[PDB]
C-alpha cells in the first residue's frame, strides 16, 4: 500500500516530538496527497492537524488509502534511533509500520506494532478577524515567560500591533509587538492582516505545548476570530503544515 521516502528523517522526528505531549494515540492517514494527522487532546480543547504533502517525499507511492494507528511514545522511541540526516522510508501493506533509516552503508530497520484507533472532523475555511505572522522563537519566549506568572494569556490585535497580557498572584504582565517589516531578516518581521480588532483569552499550558513545534518553522501564524478557535500554524516547505487549534476561555 505505502512506500514513502524522506531525504531527511529530521522532519518526522520534529513533528512527533512537537505533538506527542498533546496526543498519545492517533492515526496517520495516507492517501495520494500524502500523510495527514487529525487528533484532539483528551479534553477536546486542542486539535492537531498535520499534512506532509506527497511533494515533500522522493518518492511518495500510495496504492491504497490506509490509517496507521500509532502510540506516539512508541513511535518516538523508534524515531530517536534515526539521525536527523538519515534517509527515512515508511512501508506498509496493516498490523505493522516498517521504518528503514539509511545513514555510511548503515541500515536501521524497525517494525512498529500498530493499533486499531477509531478516527473522529471538518474545519471550515475561515476568514479570521486578525492574523499575526511572527518569529516562532518570539512566540515561544512570550508564552513560556507569561506562563511563569499566569495560567491564561489575552491576545489583542489591531492595525498597529499585537499585545499578549496576563494577570496573576504577583501582578500584571504584557508583551506588545508593533507591525514591522525586516528587509534583511524576513522571518524576524511582525506582519498583521486584520479586518477588525479582536481580543481572546487562552490557556498558556496549551500555547507553550504548541511552541514545542518552534524548531519546525522560523515563523508562526496566529489567527484570531471571536466566532472560531485560535489557529496556530507552523507552515513548512511547499504547502505542508503543522496546525494547532485551541478553544478559548470565555
Amino acid at each position: 500500500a505505502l512506500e514513502a521516502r524522506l531525504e531527511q528523517a529530521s522532519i518526522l522526528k520534529k513533528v512527533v516530538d512537537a505533538i506527542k505531549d498533546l496526543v498519545q494515540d492517533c492515526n496517520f492517514d495516507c492517501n495520494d496527497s500524502g500523510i495527514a494527522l487529525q487528533a484532539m487532546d483528551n479534553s477536546h480543547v486542542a486539535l492537531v492537524s498535520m499534512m506532509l504533502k506527497a511533494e515533500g517525499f522522493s518518492p511518495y507511492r500510495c496504492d491504497r488509502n490506509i490509517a496507521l494507528g500509532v502510540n506516539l511514545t512508541s513511535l518516538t522511541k523508534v524515531l530517536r534511533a534515526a539521525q536527523n540526516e538519515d534517509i527515512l522510508t515508511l512501508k506498509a501493506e496493516p498490523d505493522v509500520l516498517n521504518l528503514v533509516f539509511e545513514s555510511t552503508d548503515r541500515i536501521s530497520e524497525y517494525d512498529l506494532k500498530l493499533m486499531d484507533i477509531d478516527q473522529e472532523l471538518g474545519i471550515p475555511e475561515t476568514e479570521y478577524a486578525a492574523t499575526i505572522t511572527m518569529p516562532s522563537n518570539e512566540f515561544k519566549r512570550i508564552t513560556t515567560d507569561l506562563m511563569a506568572m499566569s495560567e491564561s494569556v489575552t491576545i489583542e490585535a489591531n492595525k498597529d500591533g499585537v499585545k499578549f497580557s496576563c494577570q496573576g498572584d504577583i501582578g500584571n504582565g504584557s508583551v506588545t509587538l508593533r507591525q514591522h517589516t525586516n528587509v534583511e531578516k524576513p522571518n524576524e518581521s511582525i506582519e498583521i492582516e486584520l479586518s477588525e480588532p479582536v481580543s481572546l483569552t487562552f490557556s498558556l499550558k496549551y500555547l507553550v505545548n504548541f511552541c514545542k513545534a518552534s524548531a519546525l518553522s522560523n515563523t508562526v501564524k496566529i489567527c484570531l476570530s471571536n466566532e472560531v478557535p485560535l489557529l496556530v500554524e507552523y507552515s513548512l516547505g511547499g504547502s505542508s503544515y503543522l496546525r494547532f487549534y485551541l478553544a478559548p476561555k470565555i
Binding site: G122, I123, P229
Partner: peptide
C-alpha cells in the same frame, strides 16, 4: 473566565 471546548 472558563475553558470552552472546540466548536467549528
Amino acid at each position: 473566565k472558563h475553558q470552552s471546548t472546540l466548536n467549528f
